[PDB]
């Protein structure tokens, strides 16, 4: 293959042949692509409209280059909780809540960011595979820092900053978690691509809820209904989801969006401390979603699973388990 062949096919608005998206990503990840070529591909692959096959090839190449976690250190039922983007405030909190409920959580992220909010809370985010594994076992949660696990990605990273608008590369985060969890609640800000992401997870037979707030949030919203793509047994299933059916009062968006890392950390402490309000509700809702996805690994029933998910997430906060888990996560990083 070649750049002119691949870019020419993309500018002609044609889907790529099998292996072409992979070849391209591999050039990018082996330092063999000029910034102009990386940018050209990023843009053309966005404007053509990427397929699940193509996105899966890109994620596949990244994971084939990534540092893995040591063998048998990631439980087969670990989950991820994340949005493509922020609702880092929400996903950070929901992840802690889910871990506290007893579902192993391994996240993947970077500073902008998922990572910023965590280190603001005193968590050590930049850990190698060995210690992420130990964190998962000892604390029940781990965080894989993208530069540490995908160092070959640095050339693409710099180019994304330079062009500064979202591309197909914005989709790859939840799809390139180096711990490779098989379940998750995965938010997508662009509804066009949510269905594509769901297809990618379906191909690897994950149990995920790919979620899109019909108000545009990359998380389950309480502002409006949400679209859920329920991925289980290699199958996708598009549903509309109303948290009103679980008693959630309607909030308005400006109450829910993330802010900077220091502000995110403050809201985390408030919620985990027991503050009620729309932020808590959104956390409980998204945490339950990850639990429902976790349940889908050994698939039972939709409403019962949600009702259980909600009880578990609520109790994890209310008993103080979530708050304690965060405290223990911090102690872990200091004692390591």
Ligand X SMILES: O=C(O)c1ccccc1Nc1ccccc1C(=O)O
Which of the listed partners (a second copy, ligand X, none) does 176 bind, with a CB threshold of 5 to 8 Å by partner kind?
A: ligand X
Stretch that binds ligand X, among 84-92, 149-157, 283-291, 305-313 (CB under 6 A): 149-157
Using CB under 8 A as the binding rule, the residues of this chain from 46 to 75 that contact a second copy are 46-48
**Interatomic CA distance for residues 313 and 288, integer angstroms:** 6
51 is in an annotated binding site: no
**Interatomic CA distance for residues 156 and 249, integer angstroms:** 42
Bridge partners, residue 107, by sequence = 143
Neighbours of 275 (CB within 10 A): 12
**Interatomic CA distance for residues 304 and 170, integer angstroms:** 34
> Does 37 engage in binding with a second copy (CB under 8 A)?
yes
The size of the chain, in residues, is 336
Q: What is the DSSP string of 235-265?
A: B--EEEE-GGGGTPPP--GGGTS---HHHHH
**Interatomic CA distance for residues 41 and 24, integer angstroms:** 8
> Does 297 engage in binding with a second copy (CB under 8 A)?
no
311 is in an annotated binding site: no
For residue 56, report the phi and psi dihedrals to the nearest 5 degrees.
Answer: -60, -35
**Interatomic CA distance for residues 313 and 299, integer angstroms:** 19
For residues 76 and 162, which CB has a smaller minimum distance to a second copy in the complex?
162
Q: Least distance in Å: CB of 264 to a second copy? A: 23
Stretch that binds ligand X, among 11-19, 21-29, 165-173, 236-244 (CB under 6 A): 165-173
**Interatomic CA distance for residues 179 and 126, integer angstroms:** 15
CB 55 within 8 A of CB 200: yes
111 is in an annotated binding site: yes
Q: Least distance in Å: CB of 4 to a second copy? A: 4
207: which 2 tokens? Answer: 């149990």
For residues 66 and 139, which CB has a smaller minimum distance to ligand X in the complex?
66
> Site mask, a second copy, residues 122-161, x = CB under 8 A?
-------------------------------------x--
Find, among 158, 227, 240, the residue nearest to 195 by Cα: 227
Using CB under 6 A as the binding rule, the residues of this chain from 103 to 122 that contact ligand X are 110
107 is in an annotated binding site: yes
Stretch that binds ligand X, among 152-160, 203-211, 254-262, 295-303 (CB under 6 A): 152-160
112 is in an annotated binding site: yes
DSSP 335: H
**Interatomic CA distance for residues 105 and 179, integer angstroms:** 10
Q: Least distance in Å: CB of 66 to ligand X? A: 8
Annotated binding site for Mg(2+): 91, 218-219
Footprint on this chain of a second copy (rule: CB under 8 A): 2-4, 7-8, 11, 13, 34-40, 42-44, 46-48, 159, 162-167
Footprint on this chain of ligand X (rule: CB under 6 A): 110, 146-147, 150-151, 153-154, 157-158, 160, 169, 172-173, 176
Annotated binding site: 83, 87, 89-92, 107-112, 114, 160, 218-219
């Amino acid at each position: 293959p070649s750049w002119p062949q691949i870019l020419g096919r993309l500018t002609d608005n044609r889907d790529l042949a099998r292996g072409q998206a992979a070849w391209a990503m591999d050039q990018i990840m082996t330092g063999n692509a000029r910034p102009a070529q990386i940018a050209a591909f990023a843009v053309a692959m966005t404007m053509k409209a990427p397929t699940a096959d193509e996105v899966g090839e890109l994620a596949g190449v990244m994971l084939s280059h990534a540092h893995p976690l040591p063998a048998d250190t990631v439980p087969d039922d670990a989950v991820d909780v994340v949005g493509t983007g922020n609702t880092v405030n929400l996903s950070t909190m929901a992840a802690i809540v889910v871990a506290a409920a007893g579902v192993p959580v391994v996240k993947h992220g970077n500073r902008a960011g998922g990572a910023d909010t965590l280190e603001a809370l005193g968590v050590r985010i930049d850990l190698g595979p060995d210690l992420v594994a130990r964190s998962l076992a000892e604390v029940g949660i781990g965080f894989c820092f993208a530069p540490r696990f995908h160092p070959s990605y640095r050339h693409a990273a710099a180019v994304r900053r330079e062009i500064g608008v979202p591309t197909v590369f914005n989709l790859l985060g939840p799809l390139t978690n180096p711990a490779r969890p098989r379940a998750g609640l995965i938010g997508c800000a662009f509804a066009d691509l949510a269905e594509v992401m769901a297809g990618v997870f379906a191909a690897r037979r994950s149990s995920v809820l790919v979620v899109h707030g019909d108000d545009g949030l990359d998380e389950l919203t309480t502002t409006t209904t949400s679209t859920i793509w329920r991925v289980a047994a290699g199958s996708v299933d598009k549903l509309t989801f109303d948290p009103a059916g679980f008693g959630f009062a309607r909030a308005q968006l400006d109450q829910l969006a993330g802010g900077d890392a220091q502000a995110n950390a403050a809201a985390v402490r408030a919620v985990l401390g027991g503050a009620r309000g729309p932020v808590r509700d959104a956390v409980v809702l998204n945490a339950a979603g990850a639990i429902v996805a976790h349940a889908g690994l050994s698939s039972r029933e939709w409403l019962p699973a949600w009702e259980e998910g909600l009880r578990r997430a609520s109790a994890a906060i209310d008993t103080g388990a979530a708050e304690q888990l965060l405290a223990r996560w911090v102690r872990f990083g200091r004692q390591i």
